[PDB]
Subunit: 363 residues, 4 copies
């Protein structure tokens, strides 16, 4: 009959903590068969050797499989699990659970929160960071939009993607088959996978025309970017998982989403603009926030507003960790709550050194 999306931002005590989700299920507030996606901030280092991502997904899949009476593999085929590691600074570990009910109510007036999920095919290692990944992500984004019943791409406000990376073993597999990979480095492969996936969002939503995107442009032409894409790499899967979040004229949700783009890592004005775009027009209305979701990164210039920083020169602390700490702190200082989603590495996600920022709010 009618889609109603509910979104639950749940604090976690550890990567494997399912207790807060279990409390909401046991109280009857969440039917677990209606969960379509879980977006996590997990407290590993968010870089190459972060096993909290897989630990969290495994723990959630185990739990939901037992509650639903189905196998873990069926849960993973059915539910998007997107775990973004790295909870630096004051950023609070948490999960955001997306529930899509089917209700016997009319659509609410105007446009209200809508979500769609789609998975791509698995990618061969030589496809990561290249047009194959761009075009297949674009196709899956369009599918998720239709799943969400969103017709106008301007009504898409955040497209969250989990994407793969290259391990030593996967690079060697490509080599044994006579293929080369986009880069022979696991950490850099995360940027290429994030960037190709983001360009696929831009292609699908019409933010960039197809004839401007080529292999040569991926992670090189920073004038090309999506204003709503948010992509995050991990070792666990070989495909991309996509969540499209926007507003539909055919939704019964009591929530809406809005967004802006941070021009740089300290752009508090963009945080306030994203809040306003989600209907939050004053500090007292900040209690309507469900979550804030943003991309952060170290600008390629090595500077912010003309001031040097060491992020790209610091050999002890990877720059994606520093970028996450900074943007989480900036958002937290505006909204008064560090339990917000910030992910690092914003290739083709907002301008160089900036990133999209979206707000899910109660109406």
């Amino acid at each position: 009959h009618m889609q109603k999306v509910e979104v639950f931002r749940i604090p976690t005590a550890s990567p494997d903590d399912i207790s807060g989700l279990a409390t909401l299920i046991d109280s009857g507030k969440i039917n677990p068969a209606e969960i379509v996606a879980i977006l996590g901030k997990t407290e590993g280092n968010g870089c190459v050797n972060d096993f909290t991502r897989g630990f969290a997904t495994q723990s959630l899949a185990m739990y939901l499989a037992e509650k639903l009476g189905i196998s873990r593999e069926e849960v993973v085929k059915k539910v998007a699990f997107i775990m973004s590691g790295g909870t630096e600074g004051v950023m609070t570990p948490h999960i955001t659970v997306f529930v899509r009910k089917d209700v016997a109510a009319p659509a609410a007036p105007g446009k209200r929160l809508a979500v769609g999920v789609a998975f791509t095919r698995d990618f061969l290692p030589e496809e990561l960071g290249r047009m194959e990944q761009v075009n297949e992500v674009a196709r899956a984004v369009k599918e998720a939009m239709k799943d969400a019943q969103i017709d106008d791409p301007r009504d898409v406000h955040f497209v969250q993607i989990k994407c793969p990376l290259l391990t030593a073993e996967r690079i060697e597999d490509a080599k044994r088959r006579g293929k080369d990979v986009v880069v022979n480095d696991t950490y850099k492969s995360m940027a290429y996978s994030r960037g190709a996936s983001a360009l696929g969002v831009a292609l699908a939503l019409g933010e960039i025309s197809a004839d401007k995107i080529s292999n040569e442009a991926i992670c090189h032409d920073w004038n090309l970017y999506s204003s709503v894409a948010s992509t995050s790499a991990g070792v666990e899967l070989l495909n991309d998982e996509i969540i499209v979040v926007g507003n539909s004229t055919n939704s019964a949700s009591d929530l809406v989403i809005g967004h802006s783009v941070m021009k740089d890592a300290i752009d508090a004005d963009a945080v306030r603009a994203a809040l306003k775009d989600a209907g939050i027009r004053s500090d007292d209305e900040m209690d309507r926030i469900v979550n804030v979701l943003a991309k952060a990164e170290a600008a390629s210039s090595g500077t912010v507003r003309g001031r040097r920083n060491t992020m790209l020169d610091d050999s002890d602390i990877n720059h994606t960790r520093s970028a996450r700490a900074v943007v989480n702190a900036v958002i937290a200082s505006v909204v008064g709550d560090p339990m917000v989603y910030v992910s690092g590495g914003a290739e083709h996600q907002g301008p160089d050194g900036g990133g999209p920022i979206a707000v899910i709010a109660r109406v």
Copy 2:
């Protein structure tokens, strides 16, 4: 009659003196009138940070050849307070304080005073001996500042020592124990004892509440203007009192507030207001912002857990510095501001003082 000028100078590396050299060579700074240099250096700000000493040595070399005197005499004349750790987007820079005596014709204006303490025994670090001696030099520096009312003191910056392996062996040889065995934790004890010395001198807390057992344990005791930073390269405390005096002709003033926690942007705006900055348009009057940052002992901020105290890969003082610099930068639009970590007895638990120096 004293006048104080303050110069915030970006640096390209710990040993970079070129920005200071440009201002001297252009006549805008007379090196003989420099009384203190407060630096943010790009080492890790913890135990094995050698950018502090590298920066001090490079500056001492340079000012010695420019003043015709020896390096050793320069360090006895000028306070060098190098705070390592430039995490996040925090920009390495130095802040140079110039104090020139100029006869001139109301209103309170920036005044600065310096005072070195005697050298401390390692057994005295983090204990009442350090507290009482620091309180002495603060009043001494209050004097050089020509400031009579402690309510006119807005920031008290201190470089304090730490306990090395050999300084522990020394107290061991001499038959005396030290406040703690961990060299990293001695930084917190030296920082906290020094801070209590400021609260004691300024009458922020009465002396009968301060004991050895209260140091780094009773967080109800704290100064609202103290800012202390530890390093390996000395054994005494170097104190800079900054405030406003009627007997001053400076074109600057200093205000301050206290960050209740690491994301307290309201306190940043209050500090700006206390220094005469009332709108975003007037932000260009900032000379520098100076703040203390730290991880709260509860492991939380506004009820939300974070990993700073559980993260074995990144020391919590590094994270706290990144966070508070990003918050201040997002208010003033400029990450080149002074943030130092470890705020023991400096503002409440999880918070710290924040001061703004601004043109009038």
Copy 3:
């Protein structure tokens, strides 16, 4: 008559069960006979290492499926001790202990024997204090009985997993009006390791009870066990104990020997432990099943009079460095970096050293 078999298995990731599954599916391991798994997992080996729990969860879920029982029942039945930190060239792997009942002839001298025991859960304010010492000592005695070892001189390695403090657990303690032994999460690992190690020494008669008190724990480094190997983690709230030795009631084709490294570069002690396990020449290194060792930074900040920065390095915690060093030393003697090295050797060997054991085919 018990027969112990030990399988050292390379792993591709913390959750990799494929090597164990291959041995089960080939018929080489009956999963019902597994009594303990000792892992090296590739997290940072410090407070915020979740690879330890990820590995245990993955193994318990796999074995639970294979055996037709719940995960909870598997973790009550099988010791899972995951030591994080695979720095330097140290290769991630698990060592699986299988114990079966057999009818076999007697008097094979003494051969490898294994026993397992668990303590109760500890409150945060008990870590690093006599309650942990005494509970561990009782469990060590139980594990010895499980191993059918009555003579403590026949115990060659006592491997323990023990808890640690997080900021959240310290705050729980404060809310209940209790003070923890130390207010630093990393240092809490040393107190839990040290108290657990002194519990081994108490149980084996290496130190008399009247010499152990709260004040001595992590302060009197001349108190130590020569066989204790303890390892701390966020993923458990009790201690798990594996006693490994030799007994006359054993039909194993394996034996264990040990020595004590006096410092982190004591290759002589590696060769002495090999010899105590019956490996008398480089030509016989192929009989190694695994080498198990403790490593640590010396409190003096030195090795043979030479300074190092392990205790002063704010970027890399000293147990990470000690593991890389001692693994490299062992690897250079035996020609294989896939050996067990655990860092932080409080009351485990002298200050700056630690026990080292070798499991070898006869």
Copy 4:
């Protein structure tokens, strides 16, 4: 006739000149005869390591004061090669090379010889490319001549300091319309080390010019020098070269020998290098002046087929781990962790290995 003396001096900090000053004040070192100082400094050895420059500044300032000349003049006369990173048990120290002409007899056989040479400054876009290879090769040949070595087989170690790319230098290159060899500050160290190492192999005839191109640099690991040892730093724009060998025109009471570690745990190569320097037994190890070696993670992510995480670890860069490992292996053979080990051995020995030299008293 040239006489070379070499003093290995422990340091308490990067700026510690006291051990050197002791040797000068007692008359054992004439400061005007110092031609090079090779240091291990206790920074992280990567991009943001300022202990290297801090050490050089302190040494240049001290020597300029002793010789009555300017800092500028000292750095033009003396090679200062500070290699950061003292991980594991590796002990910070400096190795001071003293060379003087003498009127003395010969030939007592071949004895230690040293020569020094500097290259021009490099643009950022020349690092890791043939401009650096060829100019380094030119300078190695010059340093050979300064050492009075005509036979490349008598060169046993070629130590080099070379530049790296910072974010600001990469951005500047971009503004000038020039792309650099790699857009990554950490990886730029590998390209500078590797191009410099190939310069050595070219100068010494270890590899034909035919085989070297931009495309081969940090790609064809079959190309390598067996004596090159290179180390990158943020504190200079050129390459500084120290050639160390033996020649018939030497009156030193020292010799150098070398081998090549095939991998990070090749203790046999350590003993081979000792033997090549005349140290035939454990009893003769008191003749060591220093051991100098290159260490690295193999591009395969393995040692003798065993996986490690050095290339995967986002918390600790692999050159830090490699240094800890190889220093520990050497220390366990010679009983002393105060030896020189530098990380990143691109085109320096085979993939995963590196050269190792020993300077010994005859």
